[PDB]
């Protein structure tokens, strides 16, 4: 059946770095943007919506303002990679990659963030 | 755009009663089953998969065995209504209705279960 696959279900990233979370889906012949829907969310916070060939962020949660983008170029290859710049402790948690493309599926990915003491302390208070 | 809507985002149900949680989506003319995907889950446990015109429960979690049903008649009206019979305290939580039909969207629905002391006790020490 139509299945979304994630090569890695767990990422361990360092505070302050960039991360790309990979998410795959079958592309039969040439990609039909009008039928492609991608949601990226993390525990109910919308990160990215991709509808009609364009990024929509009118409902993007505020913690990801200016830091999230979907790599448009790889969609035609079946790669819905989400790139998060300068990762923060608040970015740790469970992400969901939800794809609709003649069929619909989603997968979960856990992100862990390591951070030095100073950053962790600032986040603690 | 194609949008899923819920008439009620919160249900309060009594232990041991039946529950039907509604989930709406636009149907232009007549519903085309070959294009329809309906997916009902509750905090990561699959309740119902309805893929291009037929129910799949080969991935249905055990907690919903024999108790969950998708009302085929209301799908044809654009309502993906989920009925859970004899609701238990474990059924409380966040449900997600995910629909793909020339477009895709989902909504969350919260269920609270009021229970008498005895059922709550049995659940507390199981
Ligand atoms: C098995 O049915 C499913 O898994 C499913 N149904 C609908 C979706 C969906 C919902 C909003 C955006 C994108 C989507 F793909 C989905 N993942």
Swiss-Prot record, chain B:
Belongs to the immunoglobulin superfamily. BTN/MOG family. Highly expressed in the heart, skeletal muscle, placenta and lung. Weakly expressed in the thymus, spleen, kidney and liver. Expressed on activated T- and B-cells, dendritic cells, keratinocytes and monocytes. Residues 2-110 form the Ig-like V-type domain. This is Programmed cell death 1 ligand 1. GO terms for molecular function: receptor ligand activity; transcription coactivator activity. One of its GO terms (biological process) is signal transduction. It comes from Homo sapiens (Human). Keywords: Adaptive immunity, Cell membrane, Disulfide bond, Endosome, Glycoprotein, Immunity, Immunoglobulin domain, Membrane, Nucleus, Receptor, Repeat, Secreted, Signal, Transmembrane, Transmembrane helix, Ubl conjugation. It is found in: Cell membrane; Early endosome membrane; Recycling endosome membrane; Nucleus. The gene is CD274. The chain holds residues 18 to 134 of 290 of the full protein. Induction: Up-regulated on T- and B-cells, dendritic cells, keratinocytes and monocytes after LPS and IFNG activation. Up-regulated in B-cells activated by surface Ig cross-linking. Plays a critical role in induction and maintenance of immune tolerance to self. As a ligand for the inhibitory receptor PDCD1/PD-1, modulates the activation threshold of T-cells and limits T-cell effector response. Through a yet unknown activating receptor, may costimulate T-cell subsets that predominantly produce interleukin-10 (IL10). Can also act as a transcription coactivator: in response to hypoxia, translocates into the nucleus via its interaction with phosphorylated STAT3 and promotes transcription of GSDMC, leading to pyroptosis.
């Amino acid at each position: 059946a139509f299945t979304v696959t994630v090569p890695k279900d767990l990422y361990v990233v360092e505070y302050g770095s960039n991360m790309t979370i990979e998410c795959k889906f079958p592309v039969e012949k040439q990609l039909d943007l009008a039928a492609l829907i991608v949601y990226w969310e993390m525990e109910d916070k919308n990160i990215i919506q991709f509808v009609h060939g364009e990024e929509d962020l009118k409902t993007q949660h505020s913690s990801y303002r200016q830091r999230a983008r979907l790599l448009k170029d790889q969609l035609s290859l079946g790669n819905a990679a989400l790139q998060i710049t300068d990762v923060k402790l608040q970015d740790a948690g469970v992400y969901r990659c939800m794809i609709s493309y003649g069929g619909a599926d989603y997968k979960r990915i856990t992100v862990k963030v390591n951070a030095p003491y100073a950053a962790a302390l600032h986040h603690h208070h």
